[PDB]
Amino acid sequence: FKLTIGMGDLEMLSSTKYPVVFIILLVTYIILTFVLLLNMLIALMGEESKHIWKLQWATTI
Amino acid sequence: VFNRPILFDIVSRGSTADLDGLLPFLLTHKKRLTDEEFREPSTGKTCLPKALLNLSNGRNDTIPVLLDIAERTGNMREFINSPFRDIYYRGQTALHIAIERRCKHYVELLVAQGADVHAQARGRFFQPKDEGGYFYFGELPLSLAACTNQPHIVNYLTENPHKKADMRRQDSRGNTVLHALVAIADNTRENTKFVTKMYDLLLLKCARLFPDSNLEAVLNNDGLSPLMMAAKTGKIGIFQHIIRREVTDEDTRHLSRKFKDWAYGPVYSSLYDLSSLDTCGEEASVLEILVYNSKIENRHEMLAVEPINELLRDKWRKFGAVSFYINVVSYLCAMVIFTLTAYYQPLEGTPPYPYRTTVDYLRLAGEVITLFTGVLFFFTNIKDLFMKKCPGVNSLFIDGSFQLLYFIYSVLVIVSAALYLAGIEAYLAVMVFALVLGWMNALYFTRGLKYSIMIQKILFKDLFRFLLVYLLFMIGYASALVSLLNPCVPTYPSCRDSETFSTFLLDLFKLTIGMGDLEMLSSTKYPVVFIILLVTYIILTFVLLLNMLIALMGETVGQVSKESKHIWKLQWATTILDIERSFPVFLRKAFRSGEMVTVGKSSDGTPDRRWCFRVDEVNWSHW
Amino acid sequence: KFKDWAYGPVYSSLYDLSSLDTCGEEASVLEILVYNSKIENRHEMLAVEPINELLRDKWRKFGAVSFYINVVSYLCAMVIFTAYYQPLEGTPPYPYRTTVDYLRLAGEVITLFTGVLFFFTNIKDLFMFQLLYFIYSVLVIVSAALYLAGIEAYLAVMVFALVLGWMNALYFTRGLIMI
Amino acid sequence: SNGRNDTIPVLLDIAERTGNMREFINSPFRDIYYRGQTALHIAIERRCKHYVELLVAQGADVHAQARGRFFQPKDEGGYFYFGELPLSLAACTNQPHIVNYLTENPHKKADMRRQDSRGNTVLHALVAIADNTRE
Ligand SMILES: N#Cc1ccc(O[C@H]2CN(S(=O)(=O)c3ccc(Cl)cn3)C[C@@]2(O)CN)cc1F
């Protein structure tokens, strides 16, 4: 979990018996996590052009 | 007096003046116009085709005199017949030319003596463009008239006292006139207009005469019906017109495939036929060809016709959704068992052969379930080779790449089991990779949804391609950088060893994240180029990551794209048909979509027993 | 634009190629259109009947085969470029006696042949993009000269000689979203 | 068929002779899908002016409720909803002549203010059926 932010220290890769495949399985982990986190943001925080500026503003009145 | 060049020139001139008088010379010398030493040795063509090709102003008086000469010489049966021994015109006859020049007078005149209306144009010029030709129209004079917009010529060839060409006649490939009409039609308005017009004309005319099964039901050498070949070749217009065929004539009612069950209020039902659209095994079906073997450029628009889309929806609602949910839950449970086995697998020393424990027996059960799944996937992938398979499936998004990933998972699980049984310790390393690939393959079951929008917008193939590019780039660049390190004494830090590549890649992975150390910079003996190489590596890594980021942004900003939706429908249909094909014949009969109905009557009062699919519509426009 | 033959649903035509494409003994239109031309409108011209089909026919005849042989040979040469497996210990002029030692040796020879091949190919143009291919080559010859001379500082330039080789290989997807 | 059939006048002619006129034209379909559809509903929905004219000339019934399952909106699991009154059916199916005649007729007229089984009057049915298409 700390690897996602980068706070945690990555000394665990020195313990695996197969660093050649652990590193491959960790790079894909980072890419998958970043894509999966970016998708929900672009799906929710993003969202036709003035539909929101009309409806959400008329709601306040 | 007259030689082959002389006669050919005088007949090409289109003047029946100098030729007159050859009769005594030809008859006293005992010669015939079809003699080997009298026609062209290369082509074999006679003078009559020379006159026909050199036709001017639509008429030439030399041909009547030429046929008169032929009848005096006693060669008329063989005169109007010319199996060109060229490697390009193997069978082109005088009638082929006469129809090819759009002349009604000559197409009447040549058949007025009754020569032939069934010549096979088997030459390499009259072959389909796929097989190295220029124009394919079947191999019949009637097919030639039908394929080049000659309604009057077809009508004359049908009802003529001399000799008529039966519409059921088949070419060298077994294709009939309907098959040729399908084969000529490209998806354009002006073409498809008269193609469909003359298709219906020929179907009605062949239904009137010879009151038996319609000509549309005849099969060529490989069994393809005209509708079947229309779907296979990728022709939207003819296919769509065949589906929505309605004939109001009382005699010819069995030719229709869309009925008018009940018009009740402003909701209008329809009764589409389903004889060739869905069959329970014991027949070829148009849907399986449309999904599996068809011209990919317009495979999506063909699926959006009135019966096919609702047929797929009905199959879904009936059994497809239930079977797909069962499959996905079974797959998820299997890979949950796989994850539990991988995590609880012992790792000490030799592979953990000594189970002798109920917990270890449960672990063995999980392992054997995993091996069963792997061998099942491998056998299903291999068995396809003896079935519908072998497309250009290397990056296709039509389940031709997910099958490749399943093949990889299966073969790698098998090799993991082999290494586990052979004492190789790397069985765990390969097994974890197999587990990861299986969990990513679990995205296969995202085809049952269109949340859903952002799931569909992201494509796994784009992500996997970038992932595989990035991993190879990192490994290849680390291999280059580790070369610069001076050999021996430490191994990874401040030195190089034969094993140091396994640990050096960790430094690059940490440094591209932002947690790396510049310790290896002093390791190399030549830092001046090492720093430049490291900077270039970081710049290219950032370029790759951000290029993938803009790829995602552009792919997800649109929401619904023109093509990103047709592809989803294609995968959904492929999944539905793959589920259907896994059921037995009787089970498919039980789940046969549509309802049995007697659409109408036929000869001898026999009811028309056709499976049909209702598609109701509402329209407040026509009363 | 000739009109050789025509029959209903076919209308053959015969386009001239006197100036559009000239092999050797004349100037050509397509070379000027692609190389020395106004860049802002270089795609409007390529939407004509003969030139597009001319390029497609050239591809179908030989372009696909030549490009697919070239890309595979270049990738194979890059993969062989043995840099990881160069002799760690010993003097840079390491003799070859072991059957496995000489195995790599070959690879070095074929890489040197590729380097001199591109060097001569680019020089033939200079004596009668391509800028990278020139520096793509001369570094290989320099490393080979350093290897045969005895200077230990050959590996540092040898690796960078064909690390740029991968960027050269990147030109195959763009003409030798976007990159 | 063909917009005219001569069997209906003869059937009605036999009907008055049989002495069952008030009961003969009454068909409360007991099917689960047609709970309420009568002769007037069928005649109106077929958009035939002459037959409905003749039918209401004797005034059998003009207040039947089409409470069956078929005559329900798509939400409830039906195919066509127009309310439950024959007047609502005539107004929904674009029959100004049928509504006009059914309102100002000598024999008997239907109450236009009447609510259906769901409380909707004819105007609510007209609003419910009117999708956002120009035609
Ligand atoms: N329920 C269910 C279901 C059945 C078949 C299927 O996939 C078909 C595509 N392939 S597959 O990717 O290799 C593949 C995927 C999943 C599985 Cl369990 C085995 N094989 C071959 C295939 O036609 C099967 N003969 C997908 C499903 F969801």
Numbering used by the authors:
A (entry chain A): 674 to 720, 728 to 741
B (entry chain B): 148 to 597, 602 to 639, 654 to 788
C (entry chain C): 405 to 485, 488 to 534, 549 to 596, 604 to 606
D (entry chain A): 203 to 337
Q: What do the study's own words say?
A:
Transient Receptor Potential Cation Channel Subfamily V Member 4 (TRPV4) is a ubiquitously expressed, nonselective, Ca2+‐permeable cation channel that belongs to the TRP family. TRPV4 is widely expressed across different tissues, such as the skin, vascular tissue, nervous system, lungs, kidneys, and bones, and contributes to diverse functions. This polymodal protein can be activated not only by environmental stimuli, including temperature, hypoosmotic conditions, and mechanical stress, but also by endogenous agonists such as anandamide and arachidonic acid. TRPV4 is involved in various physiological processes, such as osmoregulation, inflammation, nociception, and temperature sensation, and plays a vital role in human health. Dysfunction of the TRPV4 channel is implicated in various diseases, including skeletal dysplasias; neuromuscular disorders, such as Charcot‐Marie‐Tooth disease; cardiovascular diseases like hypertension; and respiratory disorders, including pulmonary edema, osteoarthritis, and renal disorders.
